[PDB]
Design a binder for this molecule. Structure first.
Ligand SMILES: Cc1cc2nc3c(=O)[nH]c(=O)nc-3n(C[C@H](O)[C@H](O)[C@H](O)COP(=O)(O)OP(=O)(O)OC[C@H]3O[C@@H](n4cnc5c(N)ncnc54)[C@H](O)[C@@H]3O)c2cc1C
Ligand SMILES: Cc1cc2nc3c(=O)[nH]c(=O)nc-3n(C[C@H](O)[C@H](O)[C@H](O)COP(=O)(O)OP(=O)(O)OC[C@H]3O[C@@H](n4cnc5c(N)ncnc54)[C@H](O)[C@@H]3O)c2cc1C
Ligand SMILES: NC(=O)c1ccc[n+]([C@@H]2O[C@H](COP(=O)([O-])OP(=O)(O)OC[C@H]3O[C@@H](n4cnc5c(N)ncnc54)[C@H](OP(=O)(O)O)[C@@H]3O)[C@@H](O)[C@H]2O)c1
Ligand SMILES: NC(=O)c1ccc[n+]([C@@H]2O[C@H](COP(=O)([O-])OP(=O)(O)OC[C@H]3O[C@@H](n4cnc5c(N)ncnc54)[C@H](OP(=O)(O)O)[C@@H]3O)[C@@H](O)[C@H]2O)c1
Lengths: 319, 324
């Protein structure tokens, strides 16, 4: 709209819970969901409290969407291009309507950044066919799914996230193998000590996954993985029911890029347990600030925090 | 017996923590209590309809939400025992716990564990007025953010009890919906901050009535009868009066159920468990606290459920780094 109290950028649990609380407080919030959350790709969420029989990630975000629009959130399906966090009112620009001499599409006195932080994928051949049908990126979320229990599981990555998620997947899978592309695991020295000592995990140095094979049916599962030795070049097909990407994540902090303080890995720095960023007036909730948990129930919680602390900012600001 | 982690509580924090530990193939035991202190199930069981919980766009009853959250905990394998913890001994290597009425000076603990999660909640104080039981959640409430928007209070006279900052904060919040908001301070001057009192006395739709106490709650006499009148009493003269009131919101402080610890883990001035910000790490290594026991700024179920997951991951990480 032309002007509102608070504008929210995002479409995940943090962006919607903030919209729910902010709209129920009669504050008229506008939500920029984008021209398209990472939870929409998940097939079934079973670790969310209140849904004992599990819930599809697509309908969960649809429930949270209608719950936001119920209390009066102006949700416009447009992508934010640039943000001007320097003048008194924060200015926002739509994509394809950007530019140095264009009029902003929406301005507000406070903005919430809940743009998520997606896990990096490798875009292997067959990945699109078996994503969330055998391939995943969160060991805590999908590791307990029955399709991985007592089955061979494979992990991609050599960092600390790989070793941590590999030993976690050993609780369910019959065997866990980690495919580091180079030699000499990149992870910490102490965590690697317990990794190579764990019986149900084996690290395969100089190995890269080339393509994902599986069933070709409605909702086909993953059955085989084609791995390739990176020095000799001999490719082979091995049994694999689960492939977990364990490379780092990419926080969507592109819009700020200096306006708000960031950390070494790219996430938005916020006061712990709070949504207060380094610039007073803009708050950050969800995976943009969280790198240690990366859960929907935790992002939804921090989204409620960003809503309440924005209303305290707005209340103490007007006359 | 003996287990890896024991959880004390039955609220959203206690169950979300139990859900993640049970899905992680652990052996968590959840003690809902024998209707300990809010009955077994959490403080949400008293609320009639929760509309600000994400994932339920048409709202959900607090009773059914915690029952869904209960079966979701037992689904992944939590040993949920409906017994109340009386004493806890967090001095030896394994944490010892005793059931109520089975504590004894020299009795054997009912369950011991290497890590404990404290999600025992923090209930809002009630005044036990006459008619409160008849009109609780039918006109009476204790959270302005949760129930302030309910249609039965919109464009109606609302009353707030308390003189602290929580009173002034919740009173101005209720002004968004009610026709008029009146706050009943017991003594002769607001206990709140000078700046928070400034915005209170300046808000047009609120009026502060010093030296006034609510004595009785009046309303309809039907099965689901709403609140219609409130009997207030001037505390200097003693003259009682009956005024129109569709909503009564308690805004006195809260009571953390931190009685079992009482010194073992560090507490704050108001009684909440102090924890490292953004984490469930308490002052004693090995015990974690999630939910309203540590949260005094939000006091929401979605935030307690989130903090319960925080206590869940950091408890599972704590056990992993201990045996390996
Ligand atoms: C494969 C995978 C599986 C997962 N499974 C689970 C699970 O089972 N249970 C669970 O609890 N969690 C799960 N998660 C975590 C999930 O990502 C949570 O939803 C996440 O923690 C919530 O992040 P968020 O609240 O910050 O918003 P997000 O869910 O990350 O939403 C991101 C939104 O930001 C929008 N956006 C970004 N930039 C812009 C911009 N300039 N302009 C406009 N809009 C923008 C995008 O449109 C996008 O929709 C999974 C994650 C992945 C990657
Ligand atoms: C009238 C009212 C309305 C509310 N409405 C909403 C709403 O609409 N939406 C929302 O998100 N929040 C609402 N809340 C907030 C509500 O209190 C949340 O549930 C709370 O913030 C989170 O509770 P908790 O998980 O921290 O633990 P709690 O649920 O508060 O308590 C845990 C339970 O553990 C039990 N227990 C205590 N001690 C022991 C012991 N030794 N042994 C065994 N068991 C024990 C008790 O029965 C206790 O109830 C409302 C609160 C009130 C008072
Ligand atoms: O440590 P962090 O994970 O938190 O942050 P990070 O710097 O992004 O580490 C990424 C980890 O995953 C590996 N990796 C990155 N891209 C990969 C790819 N296309 N294929 C296989 N492995 C890849 C990296 O191996 P390398 O060290 O060889 O890049 C590294 O071990
Ligand atoms: O957070 P916070 O500001 O709420 O902290 P807090 O200090 O616990 O708030 C207590 C406030 O509520 C008042 N209060 C306590 N019991 C009351 C009762 N039965 N009836 C009316 N008022 C009562 C107190 O009156 P007093 O100011 O007399 O303590 C005080 O003003």
């Amino acid at each position: 709209m032309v002007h509102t109290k608070v504008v929210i950028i995002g479409s995940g649990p943090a962006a919607h819970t903030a919209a729910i609380y902010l709209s129920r407080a009669e504050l008229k919030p506008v939500l920029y969901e984008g021209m398209l959350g990472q939870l929409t790709t998940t097939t079934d969420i079973e670790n969310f409290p209140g849904f004992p029989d599990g819930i599809g990630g697509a309908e969960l975000m649809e429930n949270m969407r209608k719950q936001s629009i119920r209390f009066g959130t102006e949700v416009i399906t447009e992508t934010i291009s640039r943000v001007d966090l320097s003048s008194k009112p924060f200015k926002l620009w739509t994509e394809w309507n950007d530019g140095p001499d264009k009029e902003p599409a929406c301005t507000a006195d406070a903005v919430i950044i809940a743009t998520g932080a997606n896990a990096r994928r490798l875009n292997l051949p067959g990945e699109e066919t078996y994503w969330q049908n055998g391939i995943s990126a969160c060991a805590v979320c999908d590791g307990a799914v029955p399709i991985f229990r007592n089955k061979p599981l494979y992990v991609i990555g050599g960092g600390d996230s790989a070793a941590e998620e590999a030993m976690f997947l050993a609780k369910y899978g019959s065997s866990v193998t980690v495919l580091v592309r180079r030699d000499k695991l990149r992870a910490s020295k102490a965590m690697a000590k317990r990794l190579l000592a764990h019986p149900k995990v084996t690290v395969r140095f100089n190995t890269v996954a080339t393509e994902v094979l599986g069933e070709k049916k409605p909702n086909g599962l993953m059955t085989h993985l084609r791995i390739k030795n990176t020095v000799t070049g001999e490719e082979e097909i091995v049994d694999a029911n689960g492939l977990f990407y364990a490379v780092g994540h990419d926080p969507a902090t592109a819009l700020v890029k200096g306006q708000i303080d960031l950390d070494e890995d790219g996430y938005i720095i916020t006061k712990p347990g709070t949504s207060y960023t380094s610039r007073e007036g803009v708050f950050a909730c969800g995976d943009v600030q969280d790198k240690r948990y990366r859960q929907a129930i935790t992002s939804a919680g921090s989204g409620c925090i960003a809503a309440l602390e924005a209303e305290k900012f707005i209340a103490e600001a007007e006359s």
